[PDB]
């Protein structure tokens, strides 16, 4: 799940829902840049 986290603007105090593009939510694996 994508957390709203700190932001300049927000819907309200409650977490509510976050609108994100279609895909899957997986833990970030060990990757290299």
With left for phi above 0 and alpha for psi between -120 and 50, is residue 19 left, alpha or beta?
beta
Query: How were these coordinates obtained?
Result: NMR
User: Taking a C-beta distance cutoff of 8 angstroms, is the pair 1, 16 a contact?
Assistant: no
Kindly report the backbone phi and psi dihedral angles of residue 11, in degrees, each rounded to the nearest multiple of 5, phi listed first.
-65, -40
Question: DSSP states of 1-33 as a string?
Answer: -----S-SS-S-SS-------SS---PPP----
Torsion of CA 8, 9, 15, 20, to 10 degrees: -100
Cα→Cα distances 20→1, 2, 3, 23, Å: 10, 8, 10, 9
**What span, in angstroms and rounded, lies between the C-alpha atoms of 27 and 25?**
7
Show Cβ contacts of residue 4 under 8 Å, excluding neighbours closer than 6 positions. 10, 15, 16, 18
């Amino acid at each position: 799940y994508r957390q709203s986290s700190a932001t300049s603007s927000f819907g309200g105090l409650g977490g509510g829902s976050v609108r994100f593009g279609p895909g899957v939510a997986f833990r970030a694996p060990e990757i290299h840049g």
